[PDB]
Design goal:
Retinoid X Receptor; mainly alpha; binds 4-hydroxytamoxifen; monomer; Estrogen-related receptor gamma; 66% helix; 9 helices; 207 residues
């Protein structure tokens, strides 16, 4: 499926977190490290969104609305995929892998354990890189914003990406004719973790 190939080649290069080595470890350092990593990931996510077919043909407002509603889900799906080959550890970056102790010290134990629940499920499903890049595009298109202008166009985008997933799964996993549906059913947990994380992100006043 062409869309998948396209998403695969438009996939952004790895970003380093570069935690400040002179700063003592604390919950503030973790939050600062993560706060700066996401900022840079966000800039790249925008450049990546423009590669999704049909996306840059939406109005500017509609483009913002989607990103503004899906940014956290996308950042979270990334750390999750980077962590599939690990155990009880989240790889925010190659130079910033958080274990349970660091999560506790960061006051993110509950949140990270929820991100680990997502990872646990995808490991079980043997989530391929192709499904990762597509699910990420879908999460953006299906972000459920309230301020979309052209609802038809956004639903259109949703459909072309959904079709790519369905098509990919139809040819790569003939052994499971319901894989695509299983993949779509992992989205609720993603939405759930994302909204809870966004909540925390505001309680902390990050901005
Ligand atoms: C779960 C870690 C995280 C962020 C994160 C998620 C995925 C990823 O790849 C990198 C970081 C996080 C932290 C800050 C943030 O704000 C950006 C806006 N400001 C900093 C300009 C977004 C996500 C976070 C979110 C809310 C509170 C505390 C931590």
């Amino acid at each position: 499926n062409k869309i998948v190939s396209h998403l695969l080649v438009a996939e952004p290069e790895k970003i380093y977190a570069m935690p400040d080595p002179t700063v003592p470890d604390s919950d503030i350092k973790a939050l600062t490290t993560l706060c700066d990593l996401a900022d840079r990931e966000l800039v790249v996510i925008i450049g990546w969104a423009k590669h999704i077919p049909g996306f840059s043909t939406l109005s500017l407002a509609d483009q913002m609305s989607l990103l503004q509603s899906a940014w956290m889900e996308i950042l979270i799906l990334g750390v999750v995929y980077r962590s599939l080959s690990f155990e009880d550890e989240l790889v925010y970056a190659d130079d910033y892998i958080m274990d349970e102790d660091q999560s506790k010290l960061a006051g993110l134990l509950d949140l990270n354990n929820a991100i680990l629940q997502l990872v646990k499920k995808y490991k079980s499903m043997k989530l391929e890189k192709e499904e990762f890049v597509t699910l990420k595009a879908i999460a953006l298109a299906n972000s459920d914003s309230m301020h979309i202008e052209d609802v038809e166009a956004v639903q259109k985008l949703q459909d072309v990406l959904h079709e790519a997933l369905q098509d990919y799964e139809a040819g790569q996993h003939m052994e499971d004719p319901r894989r695509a549906g299983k993949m779509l059913m992992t989205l609720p947990l993603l939405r759930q973790t994302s909204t809870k994380a966004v909540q925390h992100f505001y309680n902390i006043k990050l901005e």
